Design a protein around this ligand. Structure first.
Ligand code: NA
Lengths: 224, 234
């Protein structure tokens, strides 16, 4: 209501050598009162990458904003899925975020994979938040071995949340999956009443034991 | 008071091929009434690894069950986990975490390392990364505070290093706040690059835990090392 943030990327797909993404940042204040805020632009990626694109700027809307900022994604950074985040904090403490994705070295609109073993992990019903009094979110997990041979995989899930919490969601499992078979399950987490308010990254990890390659899938759930 | 948690590891140093870590978990109810809680053991690692201590032979089906301690009593429990070779070398943090029924969070942490020495600075093949909370300031008031951090990159290699460096603060409500913009530096052999950089936590920023995350890249080798430090806004 007091702030609306908009984010647009000119490109959503880079090759493995990386490249350049230009972003259009739009911030409007439709409310009746004038408004003070700080904003910035950051990126999150595979293998724990976080990096800034645009530094913290204070803005008094008395003294709609439109800016374009770009950044280089270099080749050394890991191939996979990245999230760009325009973040605004209003003086009153309200947080507004506009997010967009790009990929590096993999196809957008293709499942993440480990050389032919695809990882389809989803928030089953698109449930992005639960009440402070608690709620339960199931996730579907489908590991499809499209290889000619066996896949020897390990799989687990945690919920990385407020107050330094890392809540187990799926214990470590190992499966030898034959050519053409699919390991399939539904796994949910109950956000108990007692868990703290805030943002939880439901973080799934899948490893090929033989190649040693890991892919993560990360999904957000807010406890209100 | 309601809970005191503690954790000890049987070892803190693994080689690159990995190994097995056993741990003793201690949860004491120091308070005067009975306390109901949930607890678990989780590991945080390099390259974004997070994983639970628990491994199961088949399909994990359990849910996170509560336990209860009578006033003055304690739970002594014991847990073990394998660290595979494929997990990245570097520093790992094991965390005993307890959430009480009333919402209070208690934690006890210990570190182990894999394929690098204990008490040695993180490095990229001779280039040494020494980043610290300068004045040991672990929290700030909800009305705001500033925290400076020292950065020292000592190049012990025979040749020059091309590094890229940046810092963010990874916080509550999905915030990733720039602390130090991406810079590239050329550090001669035997040199140290030194700077000081602080973050202002504005009043408006959300309460909770902020991970000050410094990243350093060897632009030539393409290897990256992280350093992270926590600061809580009350
Ligand atoms: Na095996």
């Amino acid at each position: 209501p007091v702030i609306e943030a908009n984010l647009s990327l000119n490109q959503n797909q880079l090759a493995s050598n990386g490249g350049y993404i230009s972003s259009q940042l739009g911030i409007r204040n439709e409310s009746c009162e004038t408004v003070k805020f700080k904003y910035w632009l950051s990126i999150k990626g595979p293998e724990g990458i976080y990096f800034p694109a645009k530094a913290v700027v204070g803005v008094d809307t008395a003294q709609m904003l439109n800016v374009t900022r770009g950044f280089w994604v270099p080749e050394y950074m890991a191939d996979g899925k990245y999230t760009v985040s325009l973040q605004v904090v209003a003086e009153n403490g309200k947080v507004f975020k506009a997010n967009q994705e790009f990929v590096k070295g993999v196809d957008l609109n293709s499942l993440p994979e480990l050389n032919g073993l695809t990882i389809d992990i989803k928030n089953q019903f698109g449930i992005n938040s639960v009440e402070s009094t608690g709620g339960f979110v199931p996730f579907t997990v489908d590991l499809n071995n499209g290889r000619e041979g066996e896949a020897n995989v390990e799989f687990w899930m945690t919920a990385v949340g407020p107050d330094g919490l890392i809540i187990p969601v799926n214990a470590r499992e190992k499966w030898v999956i034959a050519s053409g078979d699919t390991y399939s399950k539904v796994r949910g987490i109950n956000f108990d009443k007692s868990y703290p308010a805030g943002e939880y990254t439901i973080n799934a990890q899948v490893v090929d034991i033989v190649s040693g390659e890991r892919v993560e899938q990360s999904m957000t759930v807010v406890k209100k």
